[PDB]
Structures are given as C-alpha cells and as structure tokens.
Amino acid sequence: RFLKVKNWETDVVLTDTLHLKSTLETGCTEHICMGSIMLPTKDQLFPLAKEFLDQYYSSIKRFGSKAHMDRLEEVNKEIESTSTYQLKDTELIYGAKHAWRNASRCVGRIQWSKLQVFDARDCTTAHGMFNYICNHVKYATNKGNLRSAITIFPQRTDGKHDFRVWNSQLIRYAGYKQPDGSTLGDPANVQFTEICIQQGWKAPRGRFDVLPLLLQANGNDPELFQIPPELVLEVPIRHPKFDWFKDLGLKWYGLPAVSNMLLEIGGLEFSACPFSGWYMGTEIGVRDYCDNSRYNILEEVAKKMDLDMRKTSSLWKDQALVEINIAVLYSFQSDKVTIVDHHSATESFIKHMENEYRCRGGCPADWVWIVPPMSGSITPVFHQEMLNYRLTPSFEYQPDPWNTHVW
Amino acid sequence: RFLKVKNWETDVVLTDTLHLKSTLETGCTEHICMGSIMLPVRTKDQLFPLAKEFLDQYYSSIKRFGSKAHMDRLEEVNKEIESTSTYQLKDTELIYGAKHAWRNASRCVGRIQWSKLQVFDARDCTTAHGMFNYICNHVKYATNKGNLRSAITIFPQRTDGKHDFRVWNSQLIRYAGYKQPDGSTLGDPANVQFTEICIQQGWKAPRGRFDVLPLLLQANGNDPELFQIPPELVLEVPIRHPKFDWFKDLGLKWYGLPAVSNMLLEIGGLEFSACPFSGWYMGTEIGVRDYCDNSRYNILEEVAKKMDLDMRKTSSLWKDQALVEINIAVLYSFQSDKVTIVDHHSATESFIKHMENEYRCRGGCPADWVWIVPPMSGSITPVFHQEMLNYRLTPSFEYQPDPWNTHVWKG
Ligand code: HEM
Ligand code: HEM
Ligand SMILES: Cc1cc(N)nc(C[C@@H]2CNC[C@@H]2OCCNCC(F)(F)c2cccc(F)c2)c1
Ligand SMILES: Cc1cc(N)nc(C[C@@H]2CNC[C@@H]2OCCNCC(F)(F)c2cccc(F)c2)c1
Ligand SMILES: C[C@H](O)[C@H](O)[C@H]1CNc2nc(N)[nH]c(=O)c2N1
Ligand SMILES: C[C@H](O)[C@H](O)[C@H]1CNc2nc(N)[nH]c(=O)c2N1
Ligand SMILES: [Zn+2]
C-alpha cells in the first residue's frame, strides 16, 4: 500500500501515501507499462461533488463542521433538482489551483498556489470569449514580467453547448504547405491554419504569422478573432557570441498559454479553461526549433558554425543544439521577458516534490515529461524516481473539436 | 487483442501482439505507473510449465514444433524434473536462451546485435579458480585487441540456492573508489563499498584514481576468492580532445570493455546466477554518466573552468557546453585507438530500425523508454519521439541484490 521513491544521486528515500487517493486509470496494467504513450448523470455526479467538497472543507480546517454538512446538503439538493450544480468562487479557485498541483507532467508546480483565476462563467458569446482572452493575455504578459493565470468559461451542461477554444495555445504561428513540397512557418499548425482560412482568415503567408482565435460559445459554430498585435509580445532571437545568429531571422512569443485542455472540478467539466505561465527555455530551443517535424533548424545553425557534419560522432547536432538554447535564453533575458532554464526549473521541482511529500504525502509525477529534452542526466530530476497517478481536480487533454463538431 | 504505438515525428504506427506472450508483472497497475522505479528455490510444480513454455518456443523457432524430437525432449525433461527436481539444457537450448534473454531485454538500446552473441558454456566449472580462468578467456576474446565482440559466459545454474555461483563485481572491469577522512573520494565513488570489501579480503590497493578492481568470485556457495585480471588483458583508452590540447592533462582514461556481471539469467525456469556478458560502449555511458554524474567522477566544473565558460549562472548553459565537449573527446579517443564504440545518434537510429523489424517479424519489441532515451540530447534522437510498450518476456536477465548482503560466510 505505502510506496517508496528513491533519489539515486542523493540516496534520499520518500514514502508515498497520497497515491491511495488516486481515482482514475493510468493505462498501465500488471502486464504492460504504457508510461511512454502520449494518449494512454445525477448518480455519477454526487459522489464526485462530495469527494471534492470533503477535500475542500478539509483544506480550510472545517471538515465535519455544520458549514461543511450544509454545503453538501445544498449541493445534493441542487443536483437532484437541476441535474448539476454551481461552484462557489472559493471552490472554483481552490479547484483550479489543485488541478495545476495535480498535473503530473508539469515541472513548474512549485508555483501552483500563485495562480490568478479569472471567472468567466458569466460569458455567453464568442465575442465575450475574445474580450476575456485579450484581458488574460495582457494581465499574464505584464510587459514581460509574466504572471500565471487561468480563465474559466462556463461548464459543460448536456454536452451539446460546449465552450471550446479551438486553438491548442492562445498564441502560435501559422503553417502553410508550399507548391514545391516544403512547409513555410510551423508545420505543426498546417491543418489548423487551413481551417482558419476556410472560415475566412486572410493569411499573411509568412514564417511567423500569429494565428487568429477560433472560439466556440454555447455549442455554436466557432468564430474568428485576431488578438490585438500590440498584446502579443515577441522576442527576436540573437546569440551573445555569434553575430550571424540574428540573420537566421528567428523569433518566438513570450507567453506560453495552453488552451485545449479540460478542467474537471467536483465532477463538473470546464471545456474552455486557457491557462498560462512562462517558458522553460528548452521548450523553444530544443522542441520548437529542433524537432525534425517543427522548425527543424539544426542543419542551418551547424553550417553557420562550420562544424563537421559528415559524421554523427563529431556531435555536431549536439553542439548546435546547445548554442540554439543559449541564444533563446539570452534573448528572453535581454528583453526582460520571464524565462527559466532547465537547470533552475528542475532544481525547483525537486524542492517542490520534497515539500509535497512532507506536507501532502506525495506528488504525482511523470518522469518521461519532467526530464528535459536535452542534457537529461545533468538535471536532478533524471535521478529521482517518481510515481505517476491521477488525482482530481485535473486537467485532461481533449481531442480537436473539428473532429467532433457538426457545423 | 492489439496495442498500437505511434511515432510522433514520423506518424508511423505499429501494432503489438507479442505482449500477449507476457505473464510476469511490471510493477504498474491501473492506478499507478512505476515506469521510473529502478527496482519495481523453485518447486517441481512450477518448473515443468516453465520448461514446457521454453521448449515450445525453442522448437517453434527451429520449425520443429510437435515433432517427435520436440515430444521426446518434453518427456525427457519431464522425467528429469520428476526424478532430480531440475533439468539440464542442451547446448543448443542454452545458446538460443542467452540470445533470447538479450533480445528480450527491454532496457537495451543495442539489441539490433542480439543474434550475434558468442556463448561460452561454463557449466562444467567447479571452483573460483575455474571461474577466474573462464572470465580471463572471456575478456580476451571479447576485447579482440579493440575490435570488440559480444559474448556471455554462463556458469552452473542454481540448485538449492545454498550453492550459488556469483561474480561479486557488478562489472568485470571497474575502477576502485576510496573515501578519504576529509569526506572527499579518490577514484570512482560508485565503487567505495565493493573496494572496502576487496581490501578486507586481502587486496593491496594502489590508491590511485583509476585502479582496476580485482575479481571477487564465489563458486558453489563458498566464500568468494580474490583474483587480479592480468593487466595486459585490460584494454584502456586515455581520453583526449581533437581541438583542446589541455584535455589530456585532466588525466582521464576509461576501459574499453563494458561487461555486466551481476545479473541473473532465467531460461526455461532455470536460474543462472553467474552469467557475465559484454558488448561495446555507447559513448554517453562514459562521457555523460561515468564522468559527469555528481555522484561519479563529477568532472563538469574542471572542464568548464578550462574552457573559460561563464559559470556564475546556470542559464549560460555552461554545464551543457562542457558536457558536449567531454562526449566528443570520449568518441574521438576510442575511435583514434580503434576501440569499438557507438555514438548515441547511430545507436538510437539502429534501435528504431531494429524495433520496426521486430514488430514486423515477431509482433512486438518490449522497450523501456526511460532507459532507451540517452542521458543527453534526448529529443534530437529518434527514440525520444517513439512510443514504446514495456513488458516482460522470458528468457530474461534480472537484477539480483549484491551478494554481500545475503551471503552466509563459511569462514
Ligand atoms: C509558471 C510557470 C510554468 C512552467 C515553467 C511550466 C512548465 C511546464 C513544462 C516544461 C511542461 C511540459 C510542456 C510540454 O512539454 O509541452 C508543462 C506541462 C503542463 N503544465 Fe506547466 N508550467 C508552468 C505553469 C503552468 C500552469 C499555470 C498550469 C495550469 C494552471 C500548468 C499546467 C500544466 C499541464 C496541465 C501540463 C501538461 C500539458 C499537456 O498535457 O500538454 N502549468 N509545464
Ligand atoms: C553490443 C553492443 C551493446 C550496446 C551498445 C548496448 C547498449 C546498452 C546500454 C546503453 C544500456 C543501458 C546501460 C546503462 O545505462 O547502464 C544497456 C543495457 C542492458 N543491456 Fe545492452 N548493449 C550491448 C550489448 C549487450 C549484450 C551482449 C547483452 C547481453 C547478452 C546486453 C544486455 C543488456 C541488459 C540485460 C541491460 C539492462 C542492464 C541493467 O538492468 O543494468 N547488452 N545496453
Ligand atoms: C498529443 C498531446 C497530448 C498532450 N497531453 N499534450 C500535447 C501538447 C504537446 C506536448 N508537448 C508539446 C505540445 O505542447 C505544446 C504546449 N507546451 C506547453 C506550453 F508551452 F504551452 C506551456 C509551458 C509553460 C506553461 C504553460 F502554461 C504552457 C499533445
Ligand atoms: C539499481 C540497478 C538496477 C539495474 N537493473 N541496473 C543497475 C546498474 C546501473 C544501470 N545504469 C548504470 C549502472 O550500470 C552500469 C553498467 N552499464 C552497462 C555496461 F556499461 F556495462 C554495458 C554497456 C553496453 C553493453 C554491455 F554489455 C554492458 C542498477
Ligand atoms: C513518445 C514520448 O512519450 C513523447 O515523445 C514525449 C516524451 N516526453 C515529452 N516530454 C515533454 N515535456 N513534452 C513532450 O511533448 C514529450 N513527448
Ligand atoms: C530514477 C530513474 O529511473 C533512473 O535515474 C534511471 C533513468 N534512466 C536510465 N537510463 C539508463 N540507460 N541507465 C540508467 O541508469 C538510468 N537511470
Ligand atoms: Zn507504467
């Protein structure tokens, strides 16, 4: 029942008891581990609400109090009569923060309790969604001094009136297939860009075109909105040593903001809940720039560095990778836009894990995602055993709405 | 039933059926994943089924399933177990079994090579001196003056668990470690405990930074005995850098032959507690782990100091810069000395081709992503982007606890 995790660098051993509260399935079984797979009614709703409210009242040291019992009574009456219920503001804030706390793939959770929650449950139209999202963008960006935030649109009802942000992130670049076979812009976004144009977007047809928002309110057909250009903070990428680096013409945006997940709190489902923090540098320098399926820039940089590209064993890919990641960090830091390096972020996560074991009895963590995509074992998380399990409140991936939607 | 894995870079999707042949447990449940946990006497009753499963697999592989030879071998083994409580593998079976234990090793990125394994049958061995001679021969054959050849030496199987053959060393070749009164460590800090055991057993320690440890060998459950591998059989590579002439004066070297000696080989329910095996290094093992782990030789600072990197803030990525240069130096040095080594790009690319082939001909390839992805430059290797399924197939290699914890000292 009680499980131990060992750090092999320090010999520190921690005991996990929190996993006993896990509810949902991992995808693994006693016969098969799926650790590396990316995607592994009134009757159902009351136990979910009760479980949540119990943890909430426990959190504020009022478990088994009259107010605890009265709220449980209130919620039960509301579900029986209306088939759902509404969260109190205090409950919504607690829930959003805990969804982040429970996000096993997130290295940045030392920050979990510092989250600004924007209650957008009074929103009714796609134009309303756009205004809420602009305000989130401006608040979170804060002229480069980034602040974590989430904006929460109305919860699911019958499932035919969902609020959804069609975009995977609030800010991303367009991709276009070229009449010569190559891709201009971000190849990740070709399909979404096409849907945008199909819905009327006038595409600039450049390499770094900020995509418009496609917003769905109340199960309606999604609508197109452009984020005011002056709210989208971008960083030109230069290198502190290589003057030629700026000539690659690279830039990235300052605000990482995931907009396609589903927030579950107390059995209630918030299908539009865009949230934002700040970048860890490797996301941009390793994945966005160097994935073969993305901007794929390793060859160009290595050439400009005049490395021997004839043999893999010269480690030319590795040398150029480090330089790209040095450039990303330098550029953000020079322009006073919040960023964290992978050494700093992983060190903080280990401290967060220790805090969580001490105060909560554990911390669900997914090693496959937590270990950075470069220099893995020179970061402390590589050497740390982690247990992965699912706790609620939670964030869950949801499929692209253009698969599901009927026009 | 069918399980799919996807490659997120190529969109190639593969379908696993081989997982249906798995019966042993992973550590994981529907409620918890233990994929990053390093560590997640048989009765007759349990032995014949295991022997039957194995022999069925072997006879299928030689296309003789259900033959008279297959049926006669089943009867022969059944009678041997009923009568003696165990059985002996034919040489052909032992070879097939050792190759399949490697093919099945989900943490091994080098498995494209699995069918090329030289098997040394040491089941006639009776004493520690006998074990020493067999291990010396293994080292010489596998080293092959730098042109490394994969091999395994298999000592007698477990009988009652009171007469185990064991190599106490975790690898045939490793360097000593010495803890100093001031808390600093000379040599490899991973080996301090074992080094103290060797000294207690009578080893005269040179007390330098790269002293090759002696072998500590246990035959037939007896107390282990110390033996020094002839120095002329231990091939080493001094580490230098192609551009940085100061790299040589760090005084680094490493041994050419990686040889794991602490694992248990299970074939058909039989347990081979002493089965040292060897291949060749992937460079990152040495350049990333052995040299740069904080708990090992821990050379990053000294290298970065000599490179004159900005060390006041981690965001200069000085650790990452020094890491790459160290790994270039390891590959360069081995290559210049004509000692077989593989870089992480080549090894992972070959692994993906191996895995795809296995899906096509075998219906699967169990793989442990946490171990298969290299400890540097993870996402610029193709394995990072490849979904994997981890499950346990037999024959297999299993970790066993260090024998000094469990040994009954005879005196
Ligand atoms: C404040 C700074 C933050 C940092 C440095 C950070 C860092 C990261 C990183 C590096 C990842 C892996 C992302 C990837 O590889 O795509 C991640 C994932 C994730 N983060 Fe955090 N994060 C931060 C804030 C937040 C916030 C505010 C939330 C929610 C309120 C959050 C929830 C999540 C979730 C749910 C995932 C998994 C996403 C997915 O499945 O695609 N993070 N984070
Ligand atoms: C021929 C070249 C080979 C290469 C490049 C190679 C590469 C590797 C690497 C990089 C690892 C992870 C090592 C670590 O992090 O400690 C590994 C693990 C492993 N290898 Fe291979 N290997 C080779 C040959 C072999 C052979 C000949 C066998 C057995 C016959 C074998 C069986 C295993 C096993 C059982 C593990 C898991 C070890 C453990 O749990 O400690 N390998 N290999
Ligand atoms: C298939 C699938 C499943 C899943 N759960 N998730 C995905 C998104 C992928 C994961 N890996 C790359 C891409 O995710 C891109 C988004 N990255 C995270 C971030 F940049 F948006 C971010 C960083 C810090 C804070 C913050 F709020 C947001 C795909
Ligand atoms: C706790 C625990 C469990 C486990 N299964 N295993 C360990 C050995 C660890 C794994 N990671 C570092 C160390 O293993 C060190 C040995 N590495 C493998 C090698 F170098 F010997 C080798 C390389 C290529 C071919 C070959 F035949 C041998 C510890
Ligand atoms: C197949 C494998 O699970 C996949 O490539 C994962 C690996 N680890 C990751 N880790 C993070 N942080 N983000 C990712 O997108 C991925 N991708
Ligand atoms: C805790 C974690 O599982 C551990 O540090 C693992 C990670 N991946 C590894 N991968 C390899 N090849 N070898 C190792 O020793 C490890 N160590
Ligand atoms: Zn698992």
- Between helix A66-82 and helix A42-59 the angle, nearest 10°, is 160
SS3 of A165-196: the string is ECCCECCCECEEECCCCCEEECHHHHHHHHHH
Nearest to B333 by CA among B210, B234, B209, B241: B241
Strands A175-177 and A339-340: unpaired
Q: B391 — contact with chain A (CB < 8 Å)? A: yes
Mutate to test the interface with A, among B324, B337, B350, B369 (most CBs of A within 10 A): B324
B112 in contact with ligand 2, CB cutoff 6 A: no
A358 belongs to the catalytic site:
no
Candidates A119, A38, A315; CA nearest to B384 is: A38
Question: Given phi > 0 = left and psi -120 to 50 = alpha, else beta, which region is A30?
Answer: alpha
Give the residues across from B237 on adjacent strands: B254
The DSSP annotation for A284-322 comes to: IIIIIHHSTTTT--HHHHHHHTT---S-GGG-HHHHHHH
The pair of three-digit structure tokens given for residue A262, joined into one six-digit string: 């589903």
Say whether the peptide bond before residue A393 is cis (omega within 30 degrees of 0): yes
Q: Which two tokens stand for residue A172?
A: 């991303």
The contacts found for B123-128 with CB under 8 angstroms, 24 or more apart, are: B123/B88, B123/B94, B123/B154, B123/B155, B123/B156, B123/B157, B125/B155, B125/B156, B125/B165, B125/B219, B126/B219, B126/B220, B127/B219, B127/B220, B128/B217, B128/B218, B128/B219, B128/B222, B128/B224, B128/B225, B128/B227
Instruction: Answer whether B30 sits within 8 Å of A34, measured CB to CB.
Output: no
Domains of chain A and CATH, by start:
16-121+148-158+262-276+346-370 (3.90.340.10), 122-147+162-233+397-401 (3.90.440.10), 234-256+279-344 (3.90.1230.10)
Residue A32 makes CB contacts below 8 A (sequence gap 6+) with B3, B19, B22, B26, B28, B389, B390, B391
Nearest CA to ligand 2 atom 17: B108
Min CA distance, B133 vs chain A (Å)?
A: 35
**d(C-alpha A181, C-alpha A347), whole Å:** 43
3-state helix vs strand vs coil in chain A, percent to 5: 40, 15, 45
Interrupted after residues, chain A (C–N over 2.5 Å):
40
**Residue with CA at minimum distance from ligand 2 atom 2:** B279
Distance in angstroms (rounded) separating the CA atoms of residues A182 and A190: 12
Q: How far apart are CA B262 and CA A62, in angstroms?
A: 55
Q: Distance (Å, rounded) from C-alpha A52 to C-alpha B62?
A: 59
Identity of the residue in B33, B289, B323 whose CB atom sits nearest the CB atom of A28: B33
Q: Which candidate, A205, A199, A241, places its Cα nearest to that of A213?
A: A199
**Which amino acid type is present at position A101?**
R
Q: Say how far apart CA A352 and CA A178 lie, in whole Å.
A: 46
Amino acid B335 reads Q
For chain B, the farthest-separated pair of C-alpha atoms sits apart, in whole angstroms, at: 74
Q: How far is it, in rounded angstroms, from Cα A141 to Cα A234?
A: 11
- Strands B341-342 and B281-282 come out as parallel
Counting other chains too, the contacts that B293-300 makes at CB distance below 8 Å and 24 or more residues apart are B293/A9, B293/A377, B293/A383, B294/A9, B295/A8, B295/A9, B295/B189, B295/B190, B296/B188, B296/B189, B296/B190, B297/B188, B297/B252, B298/B189, B299/B250, B299/B252, B299/B326, B300/A378, B300/B326
Query: A308: how many CB neighbours lie within 10 A of its CB?
Result: 12
Catalytic-residue membership of B108: yes
Per annotation, catalytic residue among A106, A123, A196, A290:
A106
Structure tokens at A138: 């401006």
Quickly count: other Cβ atoms within 10 Å of residue B312's Cβ.
8
Residue B80 annotated in active site = no
Of B124, B189, B185, B120, nearest to B150 by C-alpha is B120
Identity at A115, one-letter amino acid code: L
- Residue A222's closest CA among A132, A119, A130? A130
DSSP B209-245: SSPBPPEEEE-TTPPPEEEPPPGGG--EEE---SS-G
Task: Report how far apart, in Å, the C-alpha atoms of B15 and of each of A29, B29, B366, B385 are.
Answer: 18, 22, 12, 16
CA distance B323 to B302: 11
The Cα A137–Cα A145 span in angstroms is 12
Resolution of this PDB entry, in A? 1.9
Q: Which amino acid is at A140?
A: A
Contact B359, B6 (CB under 8 A): no
Residue A19 contacts residue A3 (beta carbons within 8 Å): yes
Strand pairing partners for B6? B13
Q: How many CA atoms lie within 13 A of A215 on its CB side?
A: 24
Give burial (CB, 10 Å; 0-12/13-18/19+) of B300.
buried
Contact between residue B266 and residue B245 where contact means Cβ atoms under 8 Å apart: no
CA torsion sign, B238 to B242 to B246 to B247? negative
Which of A7, A315, A328, A387 is the best residue to mutate to test the B interface, defined by the most B CB atoms within 10 Å of its own CB?
A: A315
Q: From the CB of residue A80, how many other CB atoms can be counted at a distance below 10 Å?
A: 11
- B32: DSSP letter: B
On whether the CB atoms of residues B273 and B400 are closer than 8 A, the answer is yes
Q: DSSP for B109-158?
A: TTGGGTT--EEEE-TT--SHHHHHHHHHHHHHHHHGGGS---EEEEPPPP
Using DSSP's 3-state secondary structure scheme, residue A1 falls into coil
Distance, C-alpha B16 to centroid of its chain = 25
CB B22 within 8 A of CB A32: yes
d(C-alpha B313, C-alpha A244), whole Å = 24
Query: What's the burial of A90, exposed, middle or buried (CB within 10 Å: 0-12/13-18/19+)?
Result: exposed
- CB pair distance less than 8 Å for B9 and A292: yes
Angle separating helix axes A316-334 and B318-336, nearest 10 degrees: 170
Alpha-carbon distance A156 to A83, whole Å?
12
CA B230 to chain centre: 23
- Lookup: tokens for B276: 């040292």
Q: Which residues of B touch A373 (CB under 8 A)?
A: 378-379, 384
Q: Strand A261-265 relative to strand A268-270: parallel, antiparallel, unpaired?
A: antiparallel
* Cβ atoms of residues A160 and A401 within 8 Å: no
Contacts of residues A201-210 at CB distance under 8 Å and 24 or more positions apart, as own/partner, are A203/A174, A203/A176, A204/A174, A205/A176, A206/A174, A207/A173, A207/A249, A208/A173, A208/A234, A208/A251, A209/A173, A209/A174, A209/A185, A210/A171, A210/A172, A210/A173, A210/A174, A210/A253
Which of B159, B270, B178 has the alpha carbon at shortest distance from B219? Answer: B159
Chain A contact present for B154, CB below 8 A: no
| Chain A residues within an 8 Å CB radius of B30 | 25-29
By residue count, chain A amounts to 407
Peptide bond into B276 cis (omega under 30): no
Q: Per DSSP, what are the bridge partners of residue A5?
A: A14
Question: What is the token pair recorded at A281?
Answer: 């540098």
Helix, strand or coil, per DSSP, at residue B342: strand
Query: SS3 of A280, please?
Result: strand
Sign of the dihedral defined by the CA atoms of residues B60, B63, B68, B70, in that order: negative
Helix ranges restricted to H, B256-343? 283-284, 291-292, 300-306, 318-336
Determine if ligand 1 sits within 6 Å of the CB of residue A393. no
The reply, when asked if residue A278 is annotated as ligand binding, is yes
Query: How many Cβ atoms sit within 10 Å of the Cβ of residue B172?
Result: 26
CB atoms within 10 A of CB A224: 15
Nearest to A374 by CA among A310, A329, A307: A329
Closest CA to A118 of A273, A243, A342: A273
- Residues A100 and A149 sit within 8 Å (Cβ to Cβ): no
Is-contact A171 A253, C-beta < 8 A? yes
Question: Using CA of residue B345, residue B351, residue B356, residue B357, what is the dihedral sign?
Answer: positive
Q: Known catalytic residue: B123?
A: no
Judged by a CB distance cut-off of 8 A, whether residue B20 touches chain A is no
Are A33 and B34 an interchain contact pair (Cβ–Cβ within 8 Å)?
Answer: yes
The one-letter amino acid at A365: A
Helix H, strand E, coil C: the string for B194-218 is HHHHHHHCCCCCCCCCCCECCEEEE
> Do residues B221 and B163 touch, judged by C-beta distance below 8 A?
yes
Question: Chain A residue closest to B315 (CA)?
Answer: A341
* Centroid of chain to Cα A1: 31
> Do A194 and A186 touch, CB atoms closer than 8 A?
no
